[PDB]
Amino acid sequence: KYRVRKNVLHLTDTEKRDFVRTVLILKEKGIYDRYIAWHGAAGKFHTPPGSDRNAAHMSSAFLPWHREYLLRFERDLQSINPEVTLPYWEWETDAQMQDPSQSQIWSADFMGGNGNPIKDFIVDTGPFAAGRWTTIDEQGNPSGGLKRNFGATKEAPTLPTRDDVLNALKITQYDTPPWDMTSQNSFRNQLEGFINGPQLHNRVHRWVGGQMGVVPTAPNDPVFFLHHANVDRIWAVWQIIHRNQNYQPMKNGPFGQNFRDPMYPWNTTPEDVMNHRKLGYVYDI
Amino acid sequence: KYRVRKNVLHLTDTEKRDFVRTVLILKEKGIYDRYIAWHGAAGKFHTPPGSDRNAAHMSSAFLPWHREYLLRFERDLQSINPEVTLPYWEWETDAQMQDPSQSQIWSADFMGGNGNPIKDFIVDTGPFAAGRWTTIDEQGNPSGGLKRNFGATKEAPTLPTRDDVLNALKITQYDTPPWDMTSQNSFRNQLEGFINGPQLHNRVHRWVGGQMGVVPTAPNDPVFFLHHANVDRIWAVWQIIHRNQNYQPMKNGPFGQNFRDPMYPWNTTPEDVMNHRKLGYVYDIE
Numbered sequence: 001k002y003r004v005r006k007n008v009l010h011l012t013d014t015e016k017r018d019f020v021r022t023v024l025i026l027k028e029k030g031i032y033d034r035y036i037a038w039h040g041a042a043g044k045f046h047t048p049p050g051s052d053r054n055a056a057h058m059s060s061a062f063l064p065w066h067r068e069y070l071l072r073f074e075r076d077l078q079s080i081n082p083e084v085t086l087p088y089w090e091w092e093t094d095a096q097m098q099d100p101s102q103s104q105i106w107s108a109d110f111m112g113g114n115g116n117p118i119k120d121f122i123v124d125t126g127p128f129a130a131g132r133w134t135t136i137d138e139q140g141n142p143s144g145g146l147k148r149n150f151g152a153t154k155e156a157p158t159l160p161t162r163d164d165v166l167n168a169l170k171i172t173q174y175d176t177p178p179w180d181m182t183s184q185n186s187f188r189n190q191l192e193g194f195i196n197g198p199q200l201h202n203r204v205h206r207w208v209g210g211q212m213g214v215v216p217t218a219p220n221d222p223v224f225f226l227h228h229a230n231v232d233r234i235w236a237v238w239q240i241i242h243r244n245q246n247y248q249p250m251k252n253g254p255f256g257q258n259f260r261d262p263m264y265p266w267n268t269t270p271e272d273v274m275n276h277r278k279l280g281y282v283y284d285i
Numbered sequence: 286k287y288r289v290r291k292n293v294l295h296l297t298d299t300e301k302r303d304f305v306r307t308v309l310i311l312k313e314k315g316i317y318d319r320y321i322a323w324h325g326a327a328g329k330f331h332t333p334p335g336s337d338r339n340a341a342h343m344s345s346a347f348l349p350w351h352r353e354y355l356l357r358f359e360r361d362l363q364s365i366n367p368e369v370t371l372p373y374w375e376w377e378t379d380a381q382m383q384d385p386s387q388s389q390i391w392s393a394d395f396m397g398g399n400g401n402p403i404k405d406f407i408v409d410t411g412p413f414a415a416g417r418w419t420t421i422d423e424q425g426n427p428s429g430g431l432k433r434n435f436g437a438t439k440e441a442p443t444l445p446t447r448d449d450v451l452n453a454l455k456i457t458q459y460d461t462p463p464w465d466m467t468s469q470n471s472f473r474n475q476l477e478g479f480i481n482g483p484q485l486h487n488r489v490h491r492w493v494g495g496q497m498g499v500v501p502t503a504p505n506d507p508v509f510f511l512h513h514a515n516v517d518r519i520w521a522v523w524q525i526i527h528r529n530q531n532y533q534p535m536k537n538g539p540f541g542q543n544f545r546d547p548m549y550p551w552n553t554t555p556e557d558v559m560n561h562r563k564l565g566y567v568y569d570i571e
């Protein structure tokens with residue numbers, strides 16, 4: 001289990017110099033946009049159709065999907081910078097801050113800062129400011145600059161806490177019928193954050209605002225990946241605790257949710273991403 | 286070369302009954318839906334973003350993309366019933382018939398016939414009419430069935446001309462700058478149908494109407510694949526004829542349009558499929 005993924009606060013100022021530079025070199029060989037488009041496709045892709053579940057969100061594929069989404073987003077970093085790995089954003093600890101908007105992560109040498117009120121919350125600081133970065137709307141057409149607004153939502157004024165997370169790791173079941181937004185005592189649902197929406201994951205891309213709330217476009221913003229890194233590492237954590245707890249459903253899950261059913265838009269299956277070690281990456285710790 | 290892709294009108298019936306029996310199975314195992322989604326997803330992926338050119342249509346990638354598409358589909362169709370291949374629809378020969386709707390490809394035991402004007406052109410006849418076939422739309426949610434309306438468009442009253450096909454096979458260049466709708470003297474653009482459009486491939490689509498008229502809902506209609514079967518066969522012929530010539534652009538291409546770029550939604554490159562034999566199928570003319 002090599003390729004160590006590192007808390008964003010643990011990184012150097014060269015590490016950070018690198019990552020944010022590799023991303024830009026993706027973004028512009030044409031590659032990035034096709035993770036903006038994969039995440040979007042697989043969310044008009046209801047499983048089945050007309051259900052509320054999509055091959056990713058709101059079902060029991062949500063985590064391994066975003067696992068081999070992160071996975072195959074890394075390499076194309078590693079192919080651009082062997083010694084760049086994907087860092088995670090431990091938002092629970094940032095939650096404790098007096099004002100997390102002052103996390104080293106919103107520093108202006110990484111992703112940048114909060115949106116500017118005056119410019120309609122268009123991010124004007126840091127490497128992804130409007131003018132140095134390029135976003136895409138739902139239609140697959142150009143958008144114009146990033147937008148953020150931390151905590152300007154009534155329904156998510158604060159980031160989730162360490163407690164929130166400790167509680168979620170408690171949950172004995174991976175997922176529970178029917179496998180969607182209403183699944184009770186379901187680690188997945190809760191980690192997604194649909195139990196008392198909008199908790200945990202959901203909460204952030206409700207806390208961060210702009211394209212990180214409307215989902216479909218969510219990958220526009222680089223920190224999407226920092227985010228789901230943390231989500232992934234929380235799931236690597238749960239994984240061990242209940243080393244025993246495995247994926248459910250095993251079958252009888254809508255096609256695309258079971259444990260041996262490929263995950264639009266790839267042919268990849270959870271069976272295939274149930275280990276972060278076999279994937280050749282292990283989280284600082 | 287083994288797999289052998291046979292003109293629909295050469296298909297013994299048990300062979301038609303075997304092909305239609307599998308398409309369902311693929312549809313039932315919710316395996317077929319991923320094919321509609323793929324094709325609707327590449328069309329929403331512009332390259333570069335904000336420019337007519339999508340991952341499948343409107344660029345040099347149209348042929349190799351739809352060649353890969355099909356391959357994967359034959360493959361799924363194979364894994365299940367090893368004896369089933371993906372047949373082609375030779376529309377240039379149907380174009381002769383007094384009424385090319387009488388083709389025996391719209392036969393009740395095969396694809397079904399034309400839209401019923403009473404039920405708003407739903408298809409009610411054949412293994413596929415509202416009732417045994419389910420139809421997703423652009424967003425991704427069930428719409429209700431299948432629709433056809435043969436040549437109701439004043440734009441495309443009649444399928445391509447078997448004498449057109451020849452003309453497009455004369456073209457020397459696979460494609461040419463700027464690698465889009467306006468490309469001139471490009472095999473790829475003519476076959477696609479933009480030269481005085483709609484022609485050939487584009488004229489096929491508008492000819493059938495219903496879902497097949499619209500770029501994103503096209504693959505709802507199994508005929509999409511025969512159609513594209515034929516379209517791949519034509520390229521294939523083109524490749525043998527103008528063997529010297531090769532895919533273009535090689536580089537300097539719009540990421541996702543060059544010889545060795547991966548083609549959204551896959552990792553596969555035009556290079557990976559420029560030789561169809563090596564993909565393990567051939568067209569019953571060999």
Ligand SMILES: CCCCCCCCCCCCOS(=O)(=O)O
Pocket residue numbers: 440
């Ligand atoms: C100035 C006249 C405008 C020409 C046509 C405008 C829409 C008509 C196209 C009908 C077929 C569909 O064609 S499409 O444009 O939608 O692909």
Ligand SMILES: [Cu+2]
Pocket residue numbers: 057215218
């Ligand atoms: Cu998401």
